[PDB]
Amino acid sequence: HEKVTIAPLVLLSALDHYERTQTKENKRCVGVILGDANSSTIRVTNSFALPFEEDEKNSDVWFLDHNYIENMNEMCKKINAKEKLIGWYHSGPKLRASDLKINELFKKYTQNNPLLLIVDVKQQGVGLPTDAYVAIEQEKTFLHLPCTIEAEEAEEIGVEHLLRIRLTNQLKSLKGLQSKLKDVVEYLDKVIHTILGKLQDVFNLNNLQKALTVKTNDELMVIYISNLVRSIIAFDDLIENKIQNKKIQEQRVKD
Amino acid sequence: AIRDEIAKNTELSYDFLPLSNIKALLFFNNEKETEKFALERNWPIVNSKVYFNNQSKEKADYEDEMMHEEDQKTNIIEKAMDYAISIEN
Amino acid sequence: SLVKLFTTNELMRWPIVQKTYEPVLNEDDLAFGGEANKHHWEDLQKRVIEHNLRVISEYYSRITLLRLNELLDLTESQTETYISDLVNQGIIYAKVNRPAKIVNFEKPKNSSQLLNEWSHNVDELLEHIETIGHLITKEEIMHGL
Amino acid sequence: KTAKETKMLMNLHKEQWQSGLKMYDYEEKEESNLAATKSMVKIAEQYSKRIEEEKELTEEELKTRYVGRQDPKKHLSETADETLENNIVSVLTAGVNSVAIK
Amino acid sequence: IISLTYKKISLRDICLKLNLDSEQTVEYMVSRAIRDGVIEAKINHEDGFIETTELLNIYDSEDPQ
Amino acid sequence: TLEPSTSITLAERQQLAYDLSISALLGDKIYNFGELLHHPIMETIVNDSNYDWLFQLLNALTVGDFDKFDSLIKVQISKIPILAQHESFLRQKICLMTLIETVFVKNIRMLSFEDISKATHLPKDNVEHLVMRAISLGLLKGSIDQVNELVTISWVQPRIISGDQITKMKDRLVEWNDQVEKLGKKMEAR
C-alpha cells in the first residue's frame, strides 16, 4: 500500500472551516490539498477550500466549480512550483452520491490517485479527526492507510510556542475493548459476512500453554534483576543525605 | 487425641493405606477395629486399601485474596508491582 | 513428479516407480559410466533417504522410533545411521533417545521465548483497527447510497 | 487560541506524536516492539551494570581523587527508568489478557 | 540429618544409627515432622523405605517470587 | 458476488453453475460448497439433472456416505481417487473451524484424533499420514501432538458463516469487557 503524512497545519485549519460559518448538518464543506503524490508516502504541505453547495434531502444535487481551482493554481505557480494537486477533502463522516461523484472531477488535474480525506467536524472519539483513504476498484473500495503526522523543522517549533505513562494507555485501552463489542452487535442488525470472516481469522492468532508458564516467570525474574538495581538505587538513596547529614553536625561546631 | 495425631500423617500426604498392616501399626487386637477407626475419621473404604479423596480443600465460607485465589490473584501481583512505583514517585 | 516426490516420500512406492518406468533410472546405457547396473540402485536409494529425513523434520515434531522405521524404510540400526550422518555434515538436526526410543525435533530454546516468538501476535492487535476503520466507512456507503 | 485550536494541537504536536492509536500506543511499543527494543534482556541487564561499574568503581571515598562528585547519582536516575520500564511491561505482560482463568 | 544424606532409606536402618526403640516408634516421629512441612518427605509402607519428596528445581516456580 | 456485472439469462446460470460444480470436486481451495450457498448461485439453479452436485456434497460432509454422491454421478469423475481424498478434508475442515471459539470458552485450542476419525470416515493409523499430506500441499499450516493425540493448528481461512459462530465470538468480547470491570477498575483507581 501507500502512506499518508499530513502536516498539523492542514488538520488544524480544516476544523476551523466548520465553526466560522456555523454550518449545520445539511451542508458539508469540500476543499483541496497540495503536495507530492509521486512517492509512496503522501505528504500534504498545503490546503484550501471550495465554494461547494449540496442538498441534504437530495443526494443528486451538488455544485462544484473547477474554474476557481485554475485561477488558484496560477497563483501558486508564482509562489511554490513544487505544489500540485494530490487530492481533496470533504467534511462529515457520511459518504453519499454527491461525495463519491466529485472525486472524478479532481482526477483531471491530478495525475496520481487523488487522496480521500473524511473530516470529522465534531471531533467525537479517539484521535485523528480526518482519516486518510484511497480509492481503488476490484464498485469503489475505500481502504484505510497509515496516518502519520510529520512536519518541517520550522513548523514543529512554532507549534510548541502555541502550547507553551502506564495509566495513560490503560484509560484508552478500556474504552477500546468496549467499542469493539458494539461494532459486532451493530453490524449484526445491519445484516438482518465479509467483516466477520476477517475478524475470525484475526482472533485465531491452554493446551500447549501447560509448559509455557515457566517462560512467563523467567521474564519476570529478569525484571526482578532490575528490581535489585532498584534496591541498589534505594541503597544509593540512603547514601545521598548522609553526606548532608554529617555536614549538619559539622555546622554545629562552626555556628 | 494422641491416636488421632498418630494417624494424621497418613491422611493429608500418604495416599493409600493398607488393611492388615494398620492393625499392627496402631496396635489393634481385631481386624475390624481398623474400619471402625476410619468411620470416625470419615475415610473411604475399598478392598484391602483406604484412599484419601480430601486432598483438595474447598468451601469454608468465602476467601478473598488469600491462599492462591483465581481472579484476585492477578490483582495481588499487580498491587505488589504498583507499590514500588508509588514509592518511587 | 520425481522432483516434487521429495515433498511427500514414504518410500512405499519408490521401488514400484523405478521398476515400472526406468528410462534413465534402473537401466541407463547413455551418459552413465559403470561396469553393471548395481550403481543405479545404490546411488538412487542413498539420495532419496537424505531428502526423506529433511521433510519429516518439518512435519512430525515428535514421533516414536518404532513407527519411524516403517516410514523411512529403515531398520533399527539403519535409522540412527542416516540421522547421525546428516547432523555431522550440517544438514538437519533432531532428537534421538536410545533408551526411550523416542525421536523428537529438538526445538531450539535460543529464540528468547517471549522476546521473539511472542512478537508474531503483532498482526492480531494491528488488524483490529483496520477492520473497524473499513467497517465504519463501508456502513456509511450503503446507508447513504 | 480557541477551544478547537487547543485540543487539535495537543493531539498533533506537543512533545512527540504517538497518537492515531490511543490503546495501541504503549501496547504496541512496549510489547510487540521487544524484538527491536528489549530483545536479549539478559544482555540489557548487563548494560545497567556497566553504567554502575563506570561510576561506583571510580570514587568510593566521597571526595576528589578520581574527579567525581555525583557519580552515585549518575547511574541512579539512568537505571531508575530501566527498572521503571521493566515494571511497566511487567504489568502489561499480565495486561495482555490471554483469557486463561482455569 | 539422616533424611538429607539418604533419599531412600529402609525403616530398619534408622534404628541402627540412633539406637532407637523399635521401627514402630521411629515411624511416628517422622509423622510430627512433615505436618508443618519440616522434612518434606513421604513414608511408603508397602515399598518399605522413606523417600524424600524434594526434587529441587523450584527456581521456575512462583514461590521464590 | 457481483450484482451489476455479468448479466445473463436464467438458462445460462445453470451452465455457469455446471462449471462451478466440477471445480469444487477435486480441490478444497477457497472455502467449500457452502460458499456458493450465500451467493446467488446455488439458489438460482435446479436440483436435478446432475446440477445437485453442489448440494449433495454439502450435506455429505456430516453424513459421511460416499455412495449417495456416487450414485448421482457418472464413471468419468468417480474413477479418480482425488475426489475422495480432498472430500475428507472438508469433513475435518468443519472440525478445524471449531478450534477458535466453539465449545470451550477458556480459549483452549484442542482437537483430538477421535473427533476427526468418525467425521472424515478414516481409520486411526491414517490420521498421521493425513496431516502430512495437508501441510505438504499447502492446504493448512500447523503442528500436531503425537503423544497425547491432539491437534493445534495455525492461520486458516474461516468462512463467512454466522449464528453460533458470531454468538461465541461476541461472548469472548464480553470477557474482554468484563475484565474492564475487573482489572481496569483497579488500575484506574490506583
Molecular structure report:
This is part of a larger assembly, with chains A (255 residues), B (89 residues), C (145 residues), D (102 residues), E (65 residues) and F (190 residues). With 89 residues, chain B is mostly helical. Chain B contains 5 helices and 2 strands; from the N terminus they run ααααββα. In chain B, 49% of the residues lie in helices and 4% in strands. A two-stranded antiparallel ribbon of chain B has the order 1-2. In chain B, a hairpin with a 2-residue loop joins strand 1 (45-46) and strand 2. Chain C contains 5 helices and 3 strands; from the N terminus they run H-H-E-H-H-E-E-H. Chain C is elongated. With 102 residues, chain D is mainly α. Chain D has one domain (25-102). Chain D is built from 4 helices and no strands. The longest helix of chain D has 24 residues, at 71-94. Chain E has 3 helices and 3 strands. By secondary structure, chain E is of the alpha+beta class. Chain E is elongated and about 45 Å long. Classes of the chains: A alpha/beta (255), B mainly alpha (89), C mainly alpha (145), D mainly alpha (102), E alpha+beta (65), F mainly alpha (190). Chains A and D meet through helix 1, strand 10, helix 4, helix 5 and helix 7 of A and helix 1, helix 2, helix 3 and helix 4 of D. It is classed as hydrolase. The entry lists the keywords Proteasome, hydrolase. Yeast proteasome in substrate-processing state (C3-b). Chain A: 26S proteasome regulatory subunit RPN8.
List keywords for this structure.
part of a larger assembly, 6 chains, A: 255 residues, alpha/beta, Cytidine Deaminase, domain 2, 8-stranded mixed sheet, two-stranded antiparallel ribbon, 7 helices, 10 strands, extended, D: 102 residues, mainly alpha
User: Largest sheet of chain B, order of strands side by side?
Assistant: 1-2
The helix-and-strand class of chain C reads: mainly alpha
Strand content of chain B: under 5%
What is the overall silhouette of chain B? elongated
Radius of gyration of chain C: 25 Å
What does the largest sheet of chain B look like? 2 strands, antiparallel
Assess the beta-strand content of chain C as a share of residues. 5-15%
Q: What's the total number of strands of chain C?
A: 3
- Estimate the global geometry of chain C from the Cα principal axes: elongated
Helix segment count of chain B? 5
Q: Spell the H/E element sequence of chain B.
A: HHHHEEH
How many beta-strand runs of chain B? 2
Q: What multimeric state do the chains show? A: part of a larger assembly
**Sheet with most strands: strand arrangement of chain C:** 1-3-2
The greatest interface here is: A-D, 50 and 45 residues
| Number of contiguous helices of chain C | 5
The SS-based structural class of chain B is mainly alpha
Helix content of chain B: 40-55%
What is the terminal separation of chain C in angstroms?
54 Å
Listing every helix as H and every strand as E from the N terminus to the C terminus, the arrangement of chain C reads: HHEHHEEH
Query: Termini separation of chain B (Å)?
Result: 55 Å
